[PDB]
Amino acid sequence: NELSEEALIQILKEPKNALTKQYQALFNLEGVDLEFRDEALDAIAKKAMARKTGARGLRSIVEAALLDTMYDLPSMEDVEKVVIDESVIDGQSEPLLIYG
Amino acid sequence: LPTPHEIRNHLDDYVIGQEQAKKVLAVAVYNHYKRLRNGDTSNGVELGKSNILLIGPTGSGKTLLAETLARLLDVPFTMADATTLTEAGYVGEDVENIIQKLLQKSDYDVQKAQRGIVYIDEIDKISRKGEGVQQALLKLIEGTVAAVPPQGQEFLQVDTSKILFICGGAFAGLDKVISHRVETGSGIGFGATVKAKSDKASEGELLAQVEPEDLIKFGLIPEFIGRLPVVATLNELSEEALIQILKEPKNALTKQYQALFNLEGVDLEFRDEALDAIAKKAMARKTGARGLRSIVEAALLDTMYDLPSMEDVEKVVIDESVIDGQSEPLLIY
Amino acid sequence: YNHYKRLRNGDTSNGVELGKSNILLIGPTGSGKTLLAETLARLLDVPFTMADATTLTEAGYVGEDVENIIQKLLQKSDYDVQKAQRGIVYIDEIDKISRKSDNPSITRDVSGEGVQQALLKLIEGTVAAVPPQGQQEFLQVDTSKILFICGGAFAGLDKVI
Amino acid sequence: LTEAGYVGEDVENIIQKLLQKSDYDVQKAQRGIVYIDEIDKISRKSDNPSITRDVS
Amino acid sequence: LTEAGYVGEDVENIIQKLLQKSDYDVQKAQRGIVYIDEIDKISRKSGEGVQQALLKLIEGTVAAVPFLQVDTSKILFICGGAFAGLDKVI
Amino acid sequence: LVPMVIEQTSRGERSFDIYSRLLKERVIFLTGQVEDHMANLIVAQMLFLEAENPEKDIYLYINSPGGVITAGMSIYDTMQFIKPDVSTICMGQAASMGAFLLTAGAKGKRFCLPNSRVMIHQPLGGYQGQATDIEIHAREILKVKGRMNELMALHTGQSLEQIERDTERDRFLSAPEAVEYGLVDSILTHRN
Amino acid sequence: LVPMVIEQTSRGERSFDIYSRLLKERVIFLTGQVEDHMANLIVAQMLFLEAENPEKDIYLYINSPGGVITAGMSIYDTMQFIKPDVSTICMGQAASMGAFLLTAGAKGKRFCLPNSRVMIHQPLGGYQGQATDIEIHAREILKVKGRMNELMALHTGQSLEQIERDTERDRFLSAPEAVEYGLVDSILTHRN
């Protein structure tokens, strides 16, 4: 059966090798812990469904939304957490960098 | 490994412009190699690849940009074309030929081959009404176990799930597709916007806003688009951009000739006015950055052919008329 | 589960031959057909391999042959015929070999109908001659107890139904 | 099966298999039986023009 | 010369024969020119692979016999040919 | 005879008519006498363009000496009914019916070429029969005249009395004059 | 009928009609009486060519005995509006309307065949009705005549007074005479 918005949301976190988990480990190497809000994943599914990209589109959507986020972290230390919000997907907002 | 800034700094040294594209590759390469080195991932998760997609007109520095990444690292690099590839059971070749050139370049080393990178050019021109080549190439992406003969007899097979695939091509007409989606669909008419000024930023700006739906209209199979999550856009070299290419790049065209000229105690002053004419000629013939070498070569061949004929030469001065061919650079003594 | 029982019962300790049943995964493109095959290989105790139908072609042509599928299986089984004769295979893009609106058969669809004809004896079971490695020996591998899964998108099949 | 001189399997391969069942005994193999399944597939494509040799 | 992997002809004999005429001296050997004639006959439009086979020794290669593995960074590989069909391509 | 054109696209080659090719660009041509048959063709094109993309403006080129009023109103209502803005451009001439449709375009999108004639006049009609029937048709034509004058005033911005006085008899207005009168918004003389 | 021709290109062999084939090379034919229907056809072709390549000149072959002034003005406005230069070539003959469009081409790109004939005359019209409405039409034709003469003088380069004197009655100009009068820039006799 074709995947729906609800299915995409589950596939984003439920799978052991989910897209969200893969990025979390990538950020863990640098030391920062990445967290994905429930609303953020919900908007991700809506964008993928609109573009007809499906599950494969999830990786492209996250890549563009986190490109700038991971472009400074390797050389920008002192960060401890990077919260992701629905607005971040649209591009209006920016990652809520946390220091500690 | 070097941070994205370090990679970008190296790119800026050998590349002028395409700041947005450089950021994508800097992050992409950093993540791709980071995943390879950290195969364990500190958990049971199996990190997946993020193939890259480059969109830009001819002579946009795509090959040079990709070459810089390979040259920076100590891994192999290979190039290929999509027009040569065909379907199975036809006179044309198959996608497997791409892996054939990767093993040879990698010295038949599985470890060194996996860390390597491969580039594809002319990704377009094989869209719907043709589709078979995409299906054949769709297997290589996402992972395969293709086998190649050794010592070119265990037929060493290299996995294609850890190799980065960078697809580049010159999409002709994609700007119009994006225009309708991102602007008014006026096309022909008194109230339309005809591209008569040769705007060099319109295409770059429009292409930067490309979306998957635009690629679908172009003819690209949705599955193929999905295999390439990362997308980068490159703008066409404008008049001002070409001028910088002659002096700003580390191994610039002028620097190469200046080094050869100063080797014999002869200065080579490239007049700023002559540089614009050189760039203008390239745009006139649409030869791109590649034509730059030929333009300067001819202008310097006569000058460098007589310079050693006489002694005491102190300096040379290239001028506007020299590029046109109606004058010779005055020699100092 | 049924395949393991057949393998454990390979000695035919009964009055039947325990024939096999092949699966045909017809799912919409992007639903995870390939994922179900890769994930299945992480817990399989028998050799498993994947293949593409677009590369396959009828015998005697430049394209790939159907017997090449078994060649990949031997590598996973350490080139053991005994272990390779009880493995699993997952054919992909099986919807591309379908006749391209050429039922009259004006020309032989080596990439289409021709592939199906060669696979008829492979799915049911036939002693195929696989290359020694990859023609002097032509190793004989029996595909009577090998399961063959076929996955495709079948774009447009909804209209027919 | 395919015509001689091509990558495809040759017709003579059928006798080779028969010999294996007879322990490579020419006298025994000269009196056996042979079955050729899917004979309808090698049927010539009458509609197809007689331009390209139908090796298959 | 044949394509990479072929056993009909040796593709590395060009770097080897050069040293023979250079009295097996690295300095003398890495000072001349190596003219590879008829390069267009193998150029594409199997032939394409030959170009890559030659590229193995054109740059970044150490292959010589007294195995001496002498570099070829200085050897000038002047490839010549008639390029039948280049006029119409241009 | 209409010449054929080819549209080169990455997907493939395609052939179109001279008018069909411009239709894809949201351009509609209004030429010749206005009638129900030609009017329906224009209405169908407007409906088709709205379905394809209801957020893009539609360009309508008007060059006709006028025609039936019912056929013309069928187009005027369609322009207002569909949410996309219908830009009107006058080429050659724009008579009563043509001028009415020219000024019916979205505000700020009504254009006219430098050398173009615009004529506005009261509706023309006629009926023969019994005196009772004459009154019915006479009153109906008068109502149409008043209704059209009201619409002209709304689009042009002129007063009702001014429109009636100017529309009593044929009034030819040049492109510059049409701007002041409000029939059009600007004049397109060259492409910038 | 219209013969069909085959064009060789990278994609393959494509069938084109004689007129459509020449349209690809930016060649437009203006034959027969000038009317709204044929005028719009030429306008559509000019706009189509502008979008395809706004930097390449457009060639317009004029062979007509005249026609409606409004229909011809639509072509004139389009020629001046589009950025690409329009080259006008006179074949056979060029009457008042045809001559006006012939001289409306880009300065220096107007040509005429050696045996072509060019004739220029004042606008022709007429109206039947009351004395008040006829005065309106009688006054409008004069405005068109004045505007037509002004444009003719601007393109030809001669004084407005001279154009009026020569345009009062039919005046036939040969290919060489048209050059001196300013209606054409040069004469094409052979391909070099």
Ligand SMILES: Nc1ncnc2c1ncn2[C@@H]1O[C@H](COP(=O)(O)OP(=O)(O)O)[C@@H](O)[C@H]1O
């Ligand atoms: N920014 C640049 N600086 C120097 N050279 C460049 C630049 N961009 C392109 N080139 C030249 O162009 C060639 C590669 O072009 P390529 O990337 O293949 O263009 P495309 O990918 O658009 O066909 C190189 O030989 C290089 O010298």
Ligand SMILES: Nc1ncnc2c1ncn2[C@@H]1O[C@H](COP(=O)(O)OP(=O)(O)O)[C@@H](O)[C@H]1O
């Ligand atoms: N039902 C699903 N559950 C989890 N992931 C899925 C699912 N369907 C598709 N995917 C995603 O799609 C990618 C592989 O797609 P693939 O299986 O090749 O598509 P198809 O089934 O059309 O061949 C994987 O990265 C996977 O995360």
Ligand SMILES: [Mg+2]
């Ligand atoms: Mg799949």
